[PDB]
Amino acid sequence: SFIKSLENRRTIYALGRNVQDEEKVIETIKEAVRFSPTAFNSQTGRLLILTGDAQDKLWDEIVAPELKAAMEAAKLDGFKAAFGTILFFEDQAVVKNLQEQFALYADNFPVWSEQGSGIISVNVWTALAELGLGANLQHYNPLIDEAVAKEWNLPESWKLRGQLVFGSIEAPAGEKTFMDDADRFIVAK
């Protein structure tokens, strides 16, 4: 059931490293992005997938110091304790090329790219949940962008949009409420 798969995806903050088949996890991350739609099949999403030492480095050597410096002008341990982090970027070189090819609709491509980032982020999140792995989505962009690009030698054109922290589920999702259907769905014949 696709709907059941959607329901199974939740924000899990308590994450560990009890992950049995990392190769299968990577395969599924790639597939979830591969089969996601993007405007004009532009495929603007880019991923940096960090585990092990690189996972430790992101949180200890980049996020923590950047955040401290930012604040001046715990939760991090929880993120570090996870198995890995998937950093989602949108390739601005491709967006700019589309804007150049289709000037009358230049305003659309950044919007559709942003939508595209949401799309691939949740498809990956849901795919991970199907494997029994939890995840949560963070936003320490744009603070960490430069340091991340330098450390992993990323193209300047990759614009960081989100960081999906993932791993084994160590405690259940919290409670979550839903709006009244009547306030968000209108059906007319």
Ligand X SMILES: O=C(N[C@H](CO)[C@H](O)c1ccc([N+](=O)[O-])cc1)C(Cl)Cl
Residues lying near ligand X in the complex (CB under 6 A) are found at: 39-40, 102, 105, 108, 139
Q: In terms of CB distance, is 31 or 60 closer to a copy of itself?
A: 31
Of 24-32, 62-70, 71-79, 165-173, the segment contacting a copy of itself by CB under 8 A is: 24-32
Looking at residues 53 to 112 of the shown chain, list those that interact with a copy of itself (rule: CB under 8 A). 53-54, 91, 108, 111
Q: Considering just the CA atoms, what is the radius of gyration of the chain in Å?
A: 18
Write down the residue that tokens 């993120």 correspond to.
79
Minimum CB separation of residue 9 from a copy of itself in Å reads: 7
Question: Which residue type is seen at 61?
Answer: E
Total of chain residues touching ligand FMN, rule CB under 6 A: 17
Sign of CA dihedral 21, 26, 29, 33: negative
Minimum CB separation of residue 116 from ligand X in Å reads: 10
Residue 178, phi then psi, degrees to nearest 5: -130, 145
- By the 8 A CB rule, do 150 and 48 touch? no
Q: CA 100, CA 8: separation in Å to the nearest integer?
A: 41
Of 51-59, 60-68, 131-139, 153-161, the segment contacting ligand FMN by CB under 6 A is: 131-139
Binding residue per annotation — 92?
Answer: no
Q: In terms of CB distance, is 43 or 108 closer to ligand X?
A: 108
Residue 52 partner contact from a copy of itself, ligand FMN, ligand X, none using kind-dependent CB cut-offs of 5 to 8 Å: a copy of itself
Q: CA 150, CA 173: separation in Å to the nearest integer?
A: 35
Rounded to 10 deg, the angle between the 108-130 and 22-34 helix axes is: 150
* Among 68, 80, 82, 89, CA closest to 143: 68
Spell out the residues 6+ positions from residue 143 whose beta carbon is closer than 8 angstroms to its own: 66, 67, 70
Give the one residue of 14, 54, 64, 137 binding ligand FMN; rule: CB under 6 A. 137
Write down the residue that tokens 């709907």 correspond to.
3
Query: What is the binding site for a copy of itself (CB under 8 A)?
Result: 2-3, 5-7, 9, 11, 26, 28-37, 41, 43, 45-54, 91, 108, 111, 114-119, 121-123, 125-127, 130, 137, 139, 152, 154, 161, 176-179, 181, 184-189
Give the interface with ligand FMN as residue ranges (CB under 6 A).
10-11, 37-41, 112, 115-116, 118, 136-139, 173, 176
